[PDB]
Amino acid sequence: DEDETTALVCDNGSGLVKAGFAGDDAPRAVFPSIVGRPRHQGVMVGMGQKDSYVGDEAQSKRGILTLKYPIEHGIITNWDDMEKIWHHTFYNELRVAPEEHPTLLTEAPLNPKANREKMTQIMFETFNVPAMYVAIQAVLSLYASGRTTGIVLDSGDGVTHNVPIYEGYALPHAIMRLDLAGRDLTDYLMKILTERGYSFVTTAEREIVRDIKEKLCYVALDFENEMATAASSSSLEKSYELPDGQVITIGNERFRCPETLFQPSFIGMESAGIHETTYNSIMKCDIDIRKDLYANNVMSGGTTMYPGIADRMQKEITALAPSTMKIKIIAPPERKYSVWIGGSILASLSTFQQMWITKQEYDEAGPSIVHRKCF
Amino acid sequence: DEDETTALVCDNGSGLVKAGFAGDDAPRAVFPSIVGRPRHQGVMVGMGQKDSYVGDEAQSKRGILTLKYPIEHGIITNWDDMEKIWHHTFYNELRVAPEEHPTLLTEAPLNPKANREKMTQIMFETFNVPAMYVAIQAVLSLYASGRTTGIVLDSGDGVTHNVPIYEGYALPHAIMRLDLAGRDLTDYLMKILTERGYSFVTTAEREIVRDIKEKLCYVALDFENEMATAASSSSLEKSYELPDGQVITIGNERFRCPETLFQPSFIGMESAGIHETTYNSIMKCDIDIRKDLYANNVMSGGTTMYPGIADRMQKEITALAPSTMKIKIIAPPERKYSVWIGGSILASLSTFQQMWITKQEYDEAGPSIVHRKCF
Amino acid sequence: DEDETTALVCDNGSGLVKAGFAGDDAPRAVFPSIVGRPRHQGVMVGMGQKDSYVGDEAQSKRGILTLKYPIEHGIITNWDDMEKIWHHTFYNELRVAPEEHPTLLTEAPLNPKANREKMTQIMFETFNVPAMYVAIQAVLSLYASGRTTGIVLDSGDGVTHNVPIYEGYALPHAIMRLDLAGRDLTDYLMKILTERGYSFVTTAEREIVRDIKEKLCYVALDFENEMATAASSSSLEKSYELPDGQVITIGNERFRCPETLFQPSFIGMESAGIHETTYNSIMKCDIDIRKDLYANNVMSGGTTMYPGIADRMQKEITALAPSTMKIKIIAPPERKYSVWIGGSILASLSTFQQMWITKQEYDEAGPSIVHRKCF
């Protein structure tokens, strides 16, 4: 609180907002992106509740609330709800006066121009920021990495991409999309557990299943052989206590759930699994740069956090590639916050501080400015 | 009683067993699935009563008895009780020697493998059937229909499903579940009648309320406008004589009870009403097959028997679908026995007689056989 | 069905088989070249479906099926699938007995010798044709035209060529290749529509986009000025109803998609646009024959069907050529079937009937015969 200034790095996630100050090593505020007020709301004797805050309160308030994601699949679809999320971010989580900070916002891949313009309009008109930037989330991640060359497999919450990069450039024609990512894997685990006679269907039960997924699932060494071991499997049958206190047993569901990344037909997806899309992406590049891609396969995103994933990707890529090809899979430790960190590096870039968009630019060429000939 | 043979078609319902001979047009035996013996049992001077027969005796014996459904929510949960129901089916209702007849059994959606194996074990070991098949009840219904394409709304006793079908295949990812169906509507009518100062709480009173529901409830043309007419409603106020002989008056409860299918929040269900699930199911299918689904919405199940339901579904679907979409609701007349009829067609399928499971198959690969690579 | 005979003219296209009788004015059978069976195949209650017929059934059966082209990029790559396509052609579409008809087959430019030999082996051994010929598809088209001199721009489904011709001879060193053609333009329209927030990614969605392309795209008068008019463009914003019934709006995508033929960098292609390749081809010819080429630029192929293409080519060629050069663009009306018609003329050539290849020639010098010293 003086001269200088930082850069409000707000990564608008499909399920979680990550926000903080440029220059910090990780976001200081992480809260669910949802909207929820009592679904039954039966009055009582007073009030003192906040209608649809969701954020952190919701979670801990599981069972009372309803949820909505105004950013459900990564694109913002409800501006009144998004204004509530940004107000919460600035005033309740970070506890800042937004008019004192240049703010860098992230946007999903394929975000419409008109959507970026509405984001810009709200920042300047509603929150009175002195400036702002919009950054592409994949791009920020790439930034955080620091690798000019290599092929990234980025699997997050709602989408997975394979992005080959040569000298810093995402050759746009090589990238392929997959709908599936963590949101789909949590829904599939709810369904397969419901196969055993359990019942996980409510909003609260979804949260419970997301926790089972993140704590007990793993990727097999070989799907077929893991299924065969399931028979005499005395390991798989882990126990998990529900908040009600009942204890369920989870066995082959531990590896059947994430097997979907390699076999999208488990959820009905025709798409090619992540090892096939990696190969298909490398084959859309020049033959010449393929050796550099094969030796620099970088994993990113929350859904690449499973133990065993790098070794499995090494095995599968080795099976598809030429016999003399050197293959290397890199996974950065704390991948998931790779998107926020790239934003932090960019926003905290004094040297490229002219890329931030300003109140004068917005007034001159409206918000589009932050879209036409920059970010 | 000679060569050839029929197929024992036993549809194990949550509230009613439907059983008969393959090839008959409808089941010859329909009896409540319950277990009940005197709750007070005060001896007397002799016996000559059957402990927990339930079946038909129970009903007519209302007030003395207790009830249990070993198939309460569609999945068999008590094998000693289920053995009693099957013994009653074979020896008391159909009056057959089970060792002379291949028998097709039905099972609920999501029935565990181990449950199908126990059903199979009992048929072969306890009843000595020469063969048997297990069939999926929804599937049998689909079979009875005869429509390859279209979206079915099947509302029965304990569950309601929306199932889109293209060329005979239930695209498994499109189907959505609802807990609510007729069991819930009877419980809700007991509760709302208890609001007027009446008291319907016992087992006998539940049966009385199920009769009021089936004889006097109806679905409104528009819920809001029907409530508004309730004021000057001189029609609604129908009379119903209780077995005690008192006469109650039923008015807006006639349409408030089934309104729950369209507004599950009446019983506290967050779920989306049946018109919303229909739309949500069609939107999980390819855009291309949607025109075929919209023109082939087939209603099935006992809870789709209300007069007015097809016209209301036509109105609601028309309001959600594109303006140029051709919408058609089909309701087969005697829907409820749609499940038994599909079983009868399948079981009575000489041409597919190799799908029946045999005593040799059970002995070789145990009962699982009737589960792994068939039904 | 008597003496004489016709010539089975089968044009094996990358996406469509065109087949018929020599002497007919157009092919009597046109069906997609694909292979597809249920991707989900969920059994049901019977069969009566044909595993991977594709042909016409597929299309109308959009959403159920998968596709494969055994001729994906013009060269046949799977002989078991190709045998199915030829069986369908003869027995289901044309309804002929192939052993009664000399059959002329077409092959892509640069088809390997061994591939032509395998085509020949199948015709004689599998279908028992009395004779057969293999013809080069470009060549057949040239044949259909009837112009000895001039430079043809032939843009079809998977490839575009510029072919200068002087007295009937394709000076082989002048011809240049382009990967891009209609297959690429349909893929690019799917991608650019997905930019607006729509989602066209499935096999069924590809077919939908191919229809939007063929019905609503057009080539601009000037790309830069058309983009500038897009702003106040109230024309562009045509509506298109999807099979689901939703209605999308298409605007600048109408001309951005085919702009790729003139600017291959839109899809990442370094190649020179079709006006530059025309000029580059004319400059590889003698200076002396250039006046004849400039006055005889003939358009051929499905991708030259856009309204406005001849006028745009006249404008662009005029801008590159010497000021006193007479420039004329010819487009034959029903260009697309230009390949089949050339085959029909050739095959129906009684006078050159000795060029057909016979069962004795195949037995003597194997199939190669139809390759070494003829077609």
Ligand SMILES: Nc1ncnc2c1ncn2[C@@H]1O[C@H](COP(=O)(O)OP(=O)(O)O)[C@@H](O)[C@H]1O
């Ligand atoms: N340790 C972990 N193991 C597996 N999945 C994880 C782990 N940590 C986070 N995830 C999942 O990663 C997803 C979030 O990843 P993220 O990269 O932030 O996604 P997005 O950027 O698409 O919002 C969620 O589905 C979450 O459950």
Ligand SMILES: Nc1ncnc2c1ncn2[C@@H]1O[C@H](COP(=O)(O)OP(=O)(O)O)[C@@H](O)[C@H]1O
């Ligand atoms: N005419 C009717 N009107 C309304 N509900 C009916 C009618 N006939 C039967 N039902 C109800 O339908 C339900 C039984 O339907 P059914 O399809 O057999 O269910 P399930 O297969 O789930 O056992 C019961 O709740 C019953 O009261």
Ligand SMILES: Nc1ncnc2c1ncn2[C@@H]1O[C@H](COP(=O)(O)OP(=O)(O)O)[C@@H](O)[C@H]1O
């Ligand atoms: N009227 C049209 N306008 C634009 N493209 C068209 C038209 N008719 C056909 N096409 C396209 O032309 C291509 C087929 O042309 P064709 O000459 O048969 O190709 P090929 O011989 O390479 O198989 C397809 O991409 C198709 O969509």
